[PDB]
Short mmCIF file of C-alpha atoms and ligand atoms in Angstrom, two decimals:
data_model
loop_
_atom_site.label_atom_id
_atom_site.label_comp_id
_atom_site.label_asym_id
_atom_site.label_seq_id
_atom_site.Cartn_x
_atom_site.Cartn_y
_atom_site.Cartn_z
CA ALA A 215 -3.81 49.07 0.96
CA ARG A 216 -7.19 48.40 -0.88
CA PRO A 217 -8.84 44.98 -0.13
CA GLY A 218 -7.34 42.39 -2.55
CA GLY A 219 -3.97 44.31 -2.89
CA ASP A 220 -2.38 46.41 -5.73
CA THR A 221 -1.72 43.65 -8.41
CA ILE A 222 -3.98 42.92 -11.45
CA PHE A 223 -5.44 40.16 -9.10
CA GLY A 224 -6.72 42.94 -6.73
CA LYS A 225 -8.67 44.41 -9.71
CA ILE A 226 -10.28 40.97 -10.41
CA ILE A 227 -11.25 40.54 -6.62
CA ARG A 228 -12.83 44.08 -6.39
CA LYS A 229 -14.76 43.37 -9.69
CA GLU A 230 -12.96 46.48 -11.21
CA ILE A 231 -12.22 44.23 -14.30
CA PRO A 232 -14.13 41.16 -15.58
CA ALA A 233 -12.70 37.57 -15.42
CA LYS A 234 -13.98 34.01 -16.18
CA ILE A 235 -15.02 33.28 -12.49
CA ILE A 236 -15.81 29.58 -11.81
CA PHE A 237 -16.05 29.89 -7.98
CA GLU A 238 -16.16 32.57 -5.26
CA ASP A 239 -16.45 32.41 -1.46
CA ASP A 240 -15.41 34.97 1.22
CA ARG A 241 -11.81 33.50 1.29
CA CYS A 242 -10.90 32.91 -2.40
CA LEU A 243 -11.68 33.22 -6.11
CA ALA A 244 -11.08 30.78 -9.01
CA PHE A 245 -11.06 31.82 -12.71
CA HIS A 246 -9.86 30.65 -16.17
CA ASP A 247 -6.23 31.64 -17.15
CA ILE A 248 -6.01 34.12 -20.14
CA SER A 249 -3.07 32.04 -21.67
CA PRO A 250 -4.22 28.43 -21.13
CA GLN A 251 -1.42 25.79 -21.26
CA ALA A 252 -4.04 22.98 -21.21
CA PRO A 253 -7.65 22.46 -22.45
CA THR A 254 -8.41 23.20 -18.72
CA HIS A 255 -6.19 25.85 -17.00
CA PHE A 256 -7.56 27.92 -14.06
CA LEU A 257 -6.16 29.88 -11.08
CA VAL A 258 -7.25 29.82 -7.38
CA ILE A 259 -6.22 33.02 -5.45
CA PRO A 260 -6.88 34.14 -1.84
CA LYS A 261 -8.78 37.50 -1.44
CA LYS A 262 -6.24 38.36 1.30
CA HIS A 263 -3.12 39.91 -0.41
CA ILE A 264 -0.19 37.46 0.28
CA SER A 265 2.56 38.72 -2.11
CA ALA A 266 4.48 35.37 -2.22
CA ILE A 267 4.25 31.84 -0.77
CA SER A 268 7.77 32.60 0.69
CA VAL A 269 6.13 35.21 3.10
CA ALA A 270 2.89 33.32 4.01
CA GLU A 271 2.56 33.17 7.87
CA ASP A 272 2.01 29.96 9.95
CA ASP A 273 -1.65 31.01 10.61
CA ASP A 274 -2.29 31.28 6.76
CA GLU A 275 -2.08 27.42 6.80
CA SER A 276 -5.92 27.01 6.68
CA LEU A 277 -6.29 29.53 3.80
CA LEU A 278 -3.55 27.84 1.65
CA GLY A 279 -5.17 24.38 2.11
CA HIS A 280 -8.60 25.84 1.17
CA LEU A 281 -7.06 26.95 -2.20
CA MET A 282 -6.16 23.29 -2.89
CA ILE A 283 -9.61 21.95 -1.75
CA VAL A 284 -11.32 24.53 -4.03
CA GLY A 285 -8.87 23.61 -6.86
CA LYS A 286 -9.76 19.90 -6.53
CA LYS A 287 -13.54 20.59 -6.30
CA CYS A 288 -13.47 22.93 -9.37
CA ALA A 289 -11.42 20.23 -11.24
CA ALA A 290 -14.20 17.64 -10.59
CA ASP A 291 -16.94 20.27 -11.52
CA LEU A 292 -15.18 20.80 -14.96
CA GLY A 293 -14.95 16.99 -15.65
CA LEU A 294 -11.18 16.34 -14.99
CA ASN A 295 -11.68 12.55 -14.29
CA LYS A 296 -8.30 11.44 -15.87
CA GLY A 297 -6.32 13.78 -13.52
CA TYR A 298 -4.58 17.17 -13.35
CA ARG A 299 -1.45 19.01 -12.02
CA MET A 300 -1.43 21.75 -9.32
CA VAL A 301 1.44 24.33 -9.29
CA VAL A 302 2.58 27.17 -6.96
CA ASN A 303 5.51 29.32 -8.31
CA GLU A 304 7.91 31.42 -6.14
CA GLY A 305 10.22 34.17 -7.49
CA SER A 306 12.36 34.27 -10.68
CA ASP A 307 13.28 30.53 -10.87
CA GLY A 308 9.55 29.66 -10.22
CA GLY A 309 8.12 32.01 -12.92
CA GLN A 310 5.77 33.53 -10.23
CA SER A 311 5.07 36.44 -12.64
CA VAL A 312 2.54 38.24 -10.30
CA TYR A 313 3.20 39.36 -6.65
CA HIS A 314 -0.02 37.66 -5.27
CA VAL A 315 -0.18 33.89 -4.25
CA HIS A 316 -2.03 31.73 -6.91
CA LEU A 317 -2.54 27.98 -7.47
CA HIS A 318 -2.56 26.74 -11.12
CA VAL A 319 -4.72 23.70 -11.95
CA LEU A 320 -4.08 22.14 -15.45
CA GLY A 321 -5.59 19.07 -17.11
CA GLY A 322 -7.49 17.84 -20.19
CA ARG A 323 -4.20 16.47 -21.69
CA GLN A 324 -1.25 14.26 -20.57
CA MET A 325 1.11 16.39 -18.34
CA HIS A 326 4.84 15.49 -18.82
CA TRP A 327 7.89 15.24 -16.53
CA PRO A 328 9.89 17.18 -15.49
CA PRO A 329 7.28 19.89 -14.66
CA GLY A 330 9.26 22.47 -16.71
CA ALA B 958 -3.77 -0.78 7.82
CA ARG B 959 -0.41 0.15 9.56
CA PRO B 960 0.87 3.66 10.64
CA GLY B 961 1.46 5.71 7.41
CA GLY B 962 -0.03 3.24 4.88
CA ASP B 963 0.79 0.40 2.44
CA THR B 964 2.88 2.46 -0.15
CA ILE B 965 6.64 2.97 -0.44
CA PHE B 966 6.01 6.34 1.44
CA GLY B 967 4.65 4.34 4.43
CA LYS B 968 7.98 2.44 4.55
CA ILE B 969 9.81 5.82 4.61
CA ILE B 970 7.51 7.17 7.42
CA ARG B 971 8.25 3.98 9.56
CA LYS B 972 12.09 4.36 8.81
CA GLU B 973 12.08 0.89 7.05
CA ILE B 974 13.62 2.53 3.88
CA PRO B 975 16.35 5.23 3.92
CA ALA B 976 15.63 8.90 3.02
CA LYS B 977 17.67 12.02 3.81
CA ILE B 978 15.15 13.77 6.11
CA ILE B 979 15.19 17.59 5.85
CA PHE B 980 12.30 18.13 8.41
CA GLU B 981 9.96 16.04 10.64
CA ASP B 982 6.98 16.93 12.92
CA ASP B 983 3.96 14.89 14.14
CA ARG B 984 1.96 15.65 10.89
CA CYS B 985 4.49 15.37 7.98
CA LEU B 986 7.96 14.41 6.64
CA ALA B 987 10.18 16.28 4.07
CA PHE B 988 13.01 14.33 2.27
CA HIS B 989 15.02 14.40 -1.00
CA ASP B 990 13.43 12.77 -4.08
CA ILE B 991 15.68 9.96 -5.48
CA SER B 992 14.86 10.91 -9.14
CA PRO B 993 15.67 14.64 -8.79
CA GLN B 994 14.71 16.96 -11.78
CA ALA B 995 16.56 20.05 -10.40
CA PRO B 996 19.67 20.77 -8.27
CA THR B 997 17.21 20.75 -5.27
CA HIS B 998 14.18 18.38 -5.49
CA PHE B 999 12.39 17.28 -2.25
CA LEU B 1000 8.94 15.95 -1.18
CA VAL B 1001 6.63 16.88 1.77
CA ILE B 1002 4.16 14.06 2.53
CA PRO B 1003 1.52 13.79 5.27
CA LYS B 1004 2.09 11.02 7.87
CA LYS B 1005 -1.71 10.32 7.38
CA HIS B 1006 -2.37 8.19 4.21
CA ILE B 1007 -4.56 10.19 1.74
CA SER B 1008 -4.38 8.12 -1.55
CA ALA B 1009 -4.69 11.24 -3.86
CA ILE B 1010 -5.66 14.96 -3.72
CA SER B 1011 -8.95 14.02 -5.62
CA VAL B 1012 -10.15 11.96 -2.49
CA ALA B 1013 -8.99 14.54 0.14
CA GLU B 1014 -11.78 15.44 2.64
CA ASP B 1015 -12.58 19.09 3.68
CA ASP B 1016 -11.31 17.76 7.12
CA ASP B 1017 -7.79 17.68 5.43
CA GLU B 1018 -7.61 21.50 4.59
CA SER B 1019 -5.33 22.37 7.57
CA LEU B 1020 -2.89 19.45 6.78
CA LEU B 1021 -2.67 20.42 3.00
CA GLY B 1022 -1.74 24.04 3.97
CA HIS B 1023 0.81 22.53 6.48
CA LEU B 1024 2.61 20.74 3.53
CA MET B 1025 3.02 24.14 1.68
CA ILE B 1026 4.17 26.01 4.89
CA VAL B 1027 6.86 23.31 5.61
CA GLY B 1028 7.56 23.26 1.82
CA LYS B 1029 8.46 26.99 1.77
CA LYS B 1030 10.54 26.87 5.07
CA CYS B 1031 12.58 23.88 3.83
CA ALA B 1032 13.19 25.76 0.45
CA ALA B 1033 14.58 28.69 2.55
CA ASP B 1034 16.73 26.41 4.87
CA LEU B 1035 18.11 24.72 1.65
CA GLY B 1036 18.95 28.23 0.26
CA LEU B 1037 16.50 28.55 -2.72
CA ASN B 1038 16.58 32.36 -2.51
CA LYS B 1039 16.05 32.78 -6.35
CA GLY B 1040 12.71 30.88 -6.13
CA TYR B 1041 11.16 27.42 -6.66
CA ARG B 1042 8.12 25.53 -8.02
CA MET B 1043 5.63 23.42 -5.91
CA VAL B 1044 3.69 20.59 -7.71
CA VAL B 1045 0.92 18.14 -6.79
CA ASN B 1046 0.20 15.41 -9.40
CA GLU B 1047 -3.29 13.84 -9.49
CA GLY B 1048 -3.92 10.59 -11.44
CA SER B 1049 -2.85 9.46 -14.92
CA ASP B 1050 -2.96 12.82 -16.78
CA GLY B 1051 -1.04 14.43 -13.84
CA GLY B 1052 1.70 11.74 -13.77
CA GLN B 1053 0.91 10.70 -10.13
CA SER B 1054 3.58 7.99 -9.46
CA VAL B 1055 2.60 7.03 -5.79
CA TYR B 1056 -0.93 6.74 -4.32
CA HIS B 1057 -0.08 8.80 -1.20
CA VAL B 1058 -0.46 12.63 -1.41
CA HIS B 1059 2.94 14.38 -2.00
CA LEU B 1060 4.20 17.94 -2.54
CA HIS B 1061 7.20 18.31 -4.95
CA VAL B 1062 9.49 21.34 -4.32
CA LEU B 1063 12.00 22.03 -7.17
CA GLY B 1064 14.70 24.80 -7.23
CA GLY B 1065 18.35 25.70 -8.04
CA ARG B 1066 17.59 26.19 -11.76
CA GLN B 1067 15.13 28.12 -13.92
CA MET B 1068 11.84 26.17 -14.25
CA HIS B 1069 10.09 26.67 -17.67
CA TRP B 1070 6.53 27.16 -18.95
CA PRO B 1071 4.38 25.24 -19.47
CA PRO B 1072 5.03 23.10 -16.31
CA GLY B 1073 4.94 19.86 -18.33
C1 CAC C 2020 10.67 9.44 -7.48
AS1 CAC C 2020 9.02 10.47 -7.83
C2 CAC C 2020 7.93 10.20 -6.20
O1 CAC C 2020 9.53 12.14 -8.13
O2 CAC C 2020 8.05 9.97 -9.25
#
């Protein structure tokens, strides 16, 4: 139980591997996605290991909302004036991919509907 | 100003328009979207009128987390045990359809990448 958990996200948090870090505070970390689906695609993750949104606790409320505030602030810092889409994925149907909560922020192009 | 605001979502919050309500507390409402893009497709909106995520105050961090906590409990009470996708749309490039903050929860099918 190392601080930041046992996923590849734990390695980014403990600075064991480099990443394109846009923002860091004592609660979270935001960085550019390796496989960008939009001219701007970044991730906001908590430093606390929550394996899935499905198992977040009621008192993680503040932390989850902070991810969104940091997502919206980083979107403004990067010049996303025409808008953006935020995404949280759970499980197989969601395409969660990694067992650590993350918020996607995408913009720089028109996003379409449905959202996949 | 009136309780819940001057959008279509205000009318829902004051029970002027019908919605099938999944969940209600003093801070938010969850109900089925009437243009569903998945076998399950519901919204969680704050009872407080924030026009868009891009104009959310740091005073709104707790409420934003609350939307995602109620989002994941509703998904579980509706039986989305294979997963789901949570979306917030900001502005023109994000396809924001209503100027009142809303969380989409979609499930009951495989969601694809990219998410629009
Ligand atoms: C009917 As809608 C709020 O999913 O654009």
